[PDB]
Amino acid sequence: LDPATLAAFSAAFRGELIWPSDADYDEARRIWNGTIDRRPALIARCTSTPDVVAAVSFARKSGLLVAVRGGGHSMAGHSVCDGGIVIDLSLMNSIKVSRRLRRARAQGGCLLGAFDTATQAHMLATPAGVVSHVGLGGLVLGGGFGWLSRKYGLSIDNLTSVEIVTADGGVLTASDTENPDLFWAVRGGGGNFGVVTAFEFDLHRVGPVRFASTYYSLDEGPQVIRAWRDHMATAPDELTWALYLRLAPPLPELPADMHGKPVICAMSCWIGDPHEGERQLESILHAGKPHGLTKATLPYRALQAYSFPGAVVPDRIYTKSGYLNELSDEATDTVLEHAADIASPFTQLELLYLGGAVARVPDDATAYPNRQSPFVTNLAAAWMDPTEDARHTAWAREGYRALAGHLSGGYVNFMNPGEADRTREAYGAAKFERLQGVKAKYDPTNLFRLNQNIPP
Amino acid sequence: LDPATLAAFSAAFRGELIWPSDADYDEARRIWNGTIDRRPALIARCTSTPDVVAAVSFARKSGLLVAVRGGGHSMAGHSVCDGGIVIDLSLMNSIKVSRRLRRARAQGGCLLGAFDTATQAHMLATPAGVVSHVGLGGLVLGGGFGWLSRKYGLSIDNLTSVEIVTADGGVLTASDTENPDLFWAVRGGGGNFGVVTAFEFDLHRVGPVRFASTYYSLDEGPQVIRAWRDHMATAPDELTWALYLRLAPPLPELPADMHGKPVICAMSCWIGDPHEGERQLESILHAGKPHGLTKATLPYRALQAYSFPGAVVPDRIYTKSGYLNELSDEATDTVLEHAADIASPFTQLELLYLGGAVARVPDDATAYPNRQSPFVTNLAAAWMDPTEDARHTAWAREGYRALAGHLSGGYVNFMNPGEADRTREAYGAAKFERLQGVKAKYDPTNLFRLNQNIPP
């Protein structure tokens, strides 16, 4: 590197630098997808927006390929690079909540659990993903969905402004009143337009949530999935119900004869009055025989921290995903036949139903595509042993292929390292064209290309 | 304020200053105990250790009364002052976790749920309090106990070093090998010796936790509290079992006829294998008839997020607490007599059993007193209506006095605003004297006196 350039970086940088020789280098460069093993030239742990400014500008002048890291959960491995710089936001974790204004201002490196802890100090919340240690940054920039989404929308449907550092080092505010073209693009366009150092969200009062998790035997799979698909077509916004087909975890609530066998783990909640919730959940828990039933009245923060049963983080993952407009009987039989071949205790075949308030937002209103498709299937393979990569990767590949005709589009935040080419078909032609024009305005040199990338 | 010393402050202070004419002043000056209404001259939202140094020194030079604020949970109201400065740490929220080294380094403004989210990304944890939005800062400096304490000790029992800003403006590292007199005092001595900007903890692997919560009618109070007291005297460290006497919350798992009436809310968990946990919890769940039983196998992050049933944060509080070396049958009847007179649905009469690993640490190894007293009673009054302060305060006051023959010592972190006199009783003569000598060395002018104060 150039001494003078690096020294100008060091003169403006207040964060922490991790070099390949430093003690923590090997752990700092690991991301959630362990199949991604890469060695950056430098890890820049920023602690402020001026730190990001200095890091972006240093990267530009130095020609270092830029990775940006929030929570490290990229299913494509985007938050680490070979030979470049990781602009690592993990220390920018602050959240300021106004109870009176039902507002949260959160830094671009927050984990979901930090954000939910801060809003719930005032019994407030806003939609985000279901696993606490996911990063707010990548999740929100891709759109963001979870337990609160049928009632309150995607994360981006509650976003009111961002602070963002663009490729030329400038700092912008983007909102409905200021740079609205950029504000449109960051609501679903990924890290393509710069590093978001602060997000501002509208919040909602969310008291205790009635919640249930239970497991159905695979021989009752047909009636259970068909009951789910039929019920969610007309369900009220307050009800959320998701199916996770997986090997049953060896938990005392489950009969021993089911441990390790494929099952349907059904999780549901009611966002609203808990007594109504209990009535609503009891009315959907008995499409099959509920094994291992857990019912609770939870603070929202505890609902957020619940997923997933077993509380084990896999080392290695591979995902294939898409949306469905309908879940046909043939699609259902295919889901069931492939779930019966799950071989790792960490793998799940996920069936999610969105719709509700997500679908009421006009498709043109944000960069997020596929609001009118209520079904999401995620073949989320996950395992420990690197010698088993091919066996678990094949499971997700063949399940996807056996479903592919029924699938449309794709969530950019469930893309795997090999799906750089699914970008156009994920956004659709109109959105992709609009994204490209924003990119030419704000990142014409494509300095930010470790993402589901939109070339200028 | 002399313009010179202020102008210096701003050249070195990279954080956010809030002044009394600013719109966000009223909200920024509120703390969890809403009975505390104070107007500081300045709120300084620090964002880094250099920010804290600048604020401390500015407050020293300017002669301003110093309040330090982590999570804002001081039951005595210490984290806001009239006419002084608030060194507010809430934006200093970052945590670095090493999975391999089982280490967490957390900034001094962290909330517990942010810390637990970060450690649980790796299936690790270390003891802390039971409500997610409490600050790590004030909790750890007083000792810190919760669900993991019977297995792994107080928070301070897993603390391996701090970075601290002393009253002269200096930055120090204190550990078992570097300034160990200071390290002893900060492990239980509160904010008396300076502002801790980073805490380093040893972590533990904590997988899924079998957990139960249930409610017993006061009709069965005697047999239930006696079973608890007898069982806990010889229980393994892995069992934690606490009683919360309260009005039953209006939740659907409870019969409506019980809503609003005094009950015993018993919460229990097993830190270890969940199949053993299920066997052990069933062994302690039927000393009376359990109502509204919830049993679940939870990730530790969700157990942390669970307390307390109802998910209500009160506006106004008043606490009286102490330790017990024994809970007689007589004491049990008094507790029950006073619990029957609970008025607010947010008040709890808490009966905790510590012991286990907390008691195996030698008394003199930290500044935390009363390790050998296994019982804690906390008369935790909590309510909303500011015209009702006197009736709820009286319940707590009179309940404490009626148990005065059984109660000794006191946790510094449960003291109320009028308990500045309890400090010697709490620490005991010996510990108090040693603390004064560390105080004479490190804060000889008592710049940090908004705490359970140890004069030098």
Ligand SMILES: Cc1cc2nc3c(=O)[nH]c(=O)nc-3n(C[C@H](O)[C@H](O)[C@H](O)COP(=O)(O)OP(=O)(O)OC[C@H]3O[C@@H](n4cnc5c(N)ncnc54)[C@H](O)[C@@H]3O)c2cc1C
């Ligand atoms: C276990 C698990 C559970 C999940 N659950 C859900 C769920 O319930 N709902 C859901 O919608 N998604 C969910 N996701 C997907 C998640 O939205 C994506 O993995 C997302 O990219 C994670 O963001 P991150 O910051 O953790 O990832 P990173 O790998 O840090 O970043 C992801 C991408 O965003 C960019 N980026 C991150 N932060 C910023 C920033 N501040 N500014 C600019 N660019 C940024 C990176 O450069 C990269 O392109 C889950 C993922 C995992 C692994």
Ligand SMILES: Cc1cc2nc3c(=O)[nH]c(=O)nc-3n(C[C@H](O)[C@H](O)[C@H](O)COP(=O)(O)OP(=O)(O)OC[C@H]3O[C@@H](n4cnc5c(N)ncnc54)[C@H](O)[C@@H]3O)c2cc1C
């Ligand atoms: C709802 C609730 C639940 C609780 N549960 C538990 C529990 O399960 N276990 C338990 O042990 N305690 C518990 N507590 C008590 C808690 O430990 C004390 O209230 C503690 O002082 C709170 O710390 P804080 O940073 O949130 O408070 P603050 O009001 O911000 O600070 C309290 C004291 O610590 C000082 N201080 C705070 N941070 C720092 C720092 N970084 N450096 C120096 N001084 C600092 C302040 O000056 C002050 O004297 C609970 C409290 C509440 C209100």
